Design a protein around this motif. Structure first.
Motif, mmCIF file in Angstrom:
data_model
loop_
_atom_site.group_PDB
_atom_site.id
_atom_site.type_symbol
_atom_site.label_atom_id
_atom_site.label_comp_id
_atom_site.label_asym_id
_atom_site.label_seq_id
_atom_site.Cartn_x
_atom_site.Cartn_y
_atom_site.Cartn_z
ATOM 1 N N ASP A 47 -83.026 80.270 -10.607
ATOM 2 C CA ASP A 47 -82.463 81.524 -11.093
ATOM 3 C C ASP A 47 -81.369 81.291 -12.129
ATOM 4 O O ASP A 47 -80.306 81.913 -12.078
ATOM 5 N N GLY A 48 -81.635 80.381 -13.062
ATOM 6 C CA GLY A 48 -80.687 80.092 -14.123
ATOM 7 C C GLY A 48 -79.552 79.153 -13.772
ATOM 8 O O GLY A 48 -78.786 78.739 -14.645
ATOM 9 N N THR A 158 -86.372 80.670 -1.819
ATOM 10 C CA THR A 158 -85.926 81.812 -1.030
ATOM 11 C C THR A 158 -84.801 81.361 -0.102
ATOM 12 O O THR A 158 -83.825 82.081 0.101
ATOM 13 N N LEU A 159 -84.930 80.162 0.456
ATOM 14 C CA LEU A 159 -83.891 79.654 1.341
ATOM 15 C C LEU A 159 -82.582 79.512 0.567
ATOM 16 O O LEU A 159 -81.506 79.806 1.087
ATOM 17 N N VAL A 160 -82.674 79.069 -0.683
ATOM 18 C CA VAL A 160 -81.482 78.929 -1.509
ATOM 19 C C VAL A 160 -80.879 80.311 -1.744
ATOM 20 O O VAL A 160 -79.665 80.482 -1.690
ATOM 21 N N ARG A 161 -81.732 81.302 -1.990
ATOM 22 C CA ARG A 161 -81.256 82.660 -2.215
ATOM 23 C C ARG A 161 -80.638 83.251 -0.947
ATOM 24 O O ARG A 161 -79.796 84.147 -1.020
ATOM 25 N N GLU A 162 -81.048 82.744 0.216
ATOM 26 C CA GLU A 162 -80.487 83.217 1.480
ATOM 27 C C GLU A 162 -79.111 82.584 1.666
ATOM 28 O O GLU A 162 -78.170 83.240 2.114
ATOM 29 N N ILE A 163 -78.994 81.306 1.321
ATOM 30 C CA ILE A 163 -77.718 80.609 1.431
ATOM 31 C C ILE A 163 -76.695 81.321 0.541
ATOM 32 O O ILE A 163 -75.529 81.462 0.908
#
Ligand SMILES: Nc1nc2c(ncn2[C@@H]2O[C@H](COP(=O)(O)OP(=O)(O)NP(=O)(O)O)[C@@H](O)[C@H]2O)c(=O)[nH]1
Ligand SMILES: [Ca+2]
Ligand SMILES: [Mg+2]
Ligand SMILES: [Mg+2]
Length: 166
Positions: A47-48, A158-163
């Protein structure tokens, strides 16, 4: 730069290593070599954001899961993996969720429920059944295939986005 520590857990043979290797090395591991504790690191742009992914691939087989708890303690997010053709691995998720809570001493840990081997047809865990479990934990459910790459990047990112929401 920014570093994200991810940990992949789940029953033996569900495909934790195959998923990690497909994500990091872009190839499918066909053979089954039980894991003790392996780690992978790779710089990626999510995501950039240029970041460093440190992924811990844990043992699913009891006999090889000695110091698993200690390796997991540093993890910021966990991929709880089961195989869609292994009902027992799905029922086992409960145990991994509890282990994560102990290791992190928290009931609010970034997690993603992953139903792997979605390329196989001997499905015994229907999508809706897994969606319901994930809903009870307040986490996303994503199906993957380490063989075809379906959902692999999605699951880890998605896991990174959850973190990041933590
Ligand atoms: N068809 C298919 N086979 C898969 C998939 N993921 C893993 N496998 C197969 O399942 C077997 C076990 O995978 P592996 O990644 O070693 O599982 P693990 O969860 O890491 N096992 P362990 O906990 O003992 O370390 C291998 O033969 C591998 O090719 C998948 O998405 N599709
Ligand atoms: Ca081998
Ligand atoms: Mg493994
Ligand atoms: Mg059924």
């Amino acid at each position: 730069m920014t570093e994200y520590k991810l940990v992949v857990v789940g029953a033996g043979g569900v495909g934790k290593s195959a998923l990690t290797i497909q994500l990091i090395q872009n190839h499918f591991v066909d053979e089954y070599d039980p894991t003790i504790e392996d780690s992978y690191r790779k710089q990626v742009v999510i995501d950039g954001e240029t970041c460093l992914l440190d992924i811990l691939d844990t043992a699913g087989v009891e006999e090889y899961s000695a110091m698993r708890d200690q390796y997991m303690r540093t993890g910021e997010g966990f991929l709880c993996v089961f195989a869609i053709n292994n009902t027992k691995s799905f029922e086992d998720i409960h145990q991994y969720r509890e282990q994560i809570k102990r290791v992190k001493d928290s009931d609010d840990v970034p997690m993603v429920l992953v139903g792997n081997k979605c390329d196989l047809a001997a499905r015994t865990v229907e999508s809706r059944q897994a969606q319901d479990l994930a809903r009870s934990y307040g986490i996303p459910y994503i199906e993957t295939s380490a063989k075809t790459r379906q959902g692999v990047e999605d699951a880890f990112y998605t896991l990174v986005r959850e973190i990041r929401q933590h």
